[PDB]
Design a protein around this ligand. Structure first.
Ligand SMILES: CC(=O)N1CCC[C@H]([C@]2(Cc3cccc(Cl)c3)C(=O)Nc3cc(Cl)ccc32)C1
Length: 86
């Protein structure tokens, strides 16, 4: 069995706003729903498409950054992990 993780309240809220329906997820599912949220909110930089802008969105408070790159996978996992129940 793959390990299911449990988003804390803010992360869960964002995932559900993107269409998530449950309370526990695989990391793959968490990342999928976050990608949908980012696209839905149009947070991608228009020119450098690997950059996600968080300075105008609650995702900024959630991750604790102003912007991040989708190519920084260890960083993204770390930002998600701070928002899981242990
Ligand atoms: C779907 C799409 O257009 N993509 C292009 C931009 C980056 C999207 C990508 C990349 C990705 C995928 C798996 C793990 C990691 Cl760590 C990152 C994704 O899938 N989910 C996701 C979630 C966040 Cl927080 C930021 C970027 C992404 C995918």
């Amino acid at each position: 069995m793959e390990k299911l993780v449990q988003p804390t309240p803010l992360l869960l809220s964002l995932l559900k706003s993107a269409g998530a329906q449950k309370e526990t997820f695989t990391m793959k599912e968490v990342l999928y729903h976050l990608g949908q949220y980012i696209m839905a909110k149009q947070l991608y930089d228009e020119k450098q498409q690997h950059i996600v802008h968080c300075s105008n969105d609650p995702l900024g408070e959630l991750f604790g950054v102003q912007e991040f790159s989708v190519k920084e996978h260890r960083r993204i996992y770390a930002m998600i992990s701070r928002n899981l129940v242990s």
